[PDB]
């Protein structure tokens, strides 16, 4: 079972540290436990979440080496994916909630009523499946990097460089999963499915385009859709 090379430990350090630096509050301790009149009150709290994703991506050298036109396509592509992952890994089986932003504990119904629709059940089912995965800050950060560095995104210029970065993250990630020896079977094939699970959530980005009026939505929410 191949384990991380020294160069992968450095990439792992870089990606884990950029994640924890840009992840809102151990500090469950700050949790809340709380129609366009609920969409409005939700979209209001997305603007800090979008910024954190940009901040994570900026704290990743390989991304800072891409032209800003590629940086923008890549960020519009992975924001919802990363926010959804960051919320699903903060699933409490007891309260049956996800924790949004710093700590606003939302329910499947509340998030459905916030305009996510079927994407609520999607992230809730993801969170429930991710409990037995026991993903540490390193594993969450490397998922975010695999999602972020996607060349299948329309309008990209450096498709070849981006696929390289992703193959790096993907291999460093598998080697860490090898080192980590989770008690779940087919763990690596099972994560590639949760990447698909995550990617499908961010492919429903028109399910906004249909549920558009526009000035009733935060500007950063409109820039990534």
């Amino acid at each position: 079972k191949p384990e991380p090379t020294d160069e992968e430990w450095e990439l792992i350090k870089t990606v884990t540290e950029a994640h924890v630096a840009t992840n809102a509050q151990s500090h469950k301790q700050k949790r809340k436990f709380l129609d366009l009149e609920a969409f409005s009150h939700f979209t209001k709290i997305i603007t800090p979440a979008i910024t954190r994703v940009v901040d994570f991506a900026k704290k990743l050298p390989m991304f800072c080496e891409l032209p800003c036109e590629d940086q923008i396509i890549l960020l519009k592509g992975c924001c919802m994916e990363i926010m959804s992952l960051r919320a699903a890994v903060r699933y409490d089986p007891e309260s049956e909630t996800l924790t949004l932003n710093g700590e606003m504990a939302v329910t499947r119904g509340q998030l459905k009523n916030g305009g996510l629709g079927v994407v609520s059940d999607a992230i809730f089912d993801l969170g429930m499946s991710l409990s037995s995965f026991n993903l540490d800050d390193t594993e969450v950060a490397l998922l975010q990097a695999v999602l972020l560095m996607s060349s299948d995104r329309p309008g990209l210029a450096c498709v070849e460089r981006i696929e390289k970065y992703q193959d790096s993250f993907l291999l460093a990630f598998e080697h860490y999963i090898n080192y980590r020896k989770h008690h779940v079977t087919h763990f690596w094939p099972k994560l590639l499915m949760k990447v698909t699970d995550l990617r499908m959530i961010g492919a429903c980005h028109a399910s906004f385009l249909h549920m558009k009026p526009t000035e009733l939505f935060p500007p950063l929410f409109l820039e990534v859709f």
């Binding site: 940009v54 900026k58 800003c68 923008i72 960020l75 519009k76 500007p219 950063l220």
Partner: peptide, 11 residues
């Protein structure tokens, strides 16, 4: 326009 996104990205 991604004007605020450029702003955020280009410091």
């Amino acid at each position: 326009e991604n004007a605020l996104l450029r702003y955020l990205l280009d410091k």
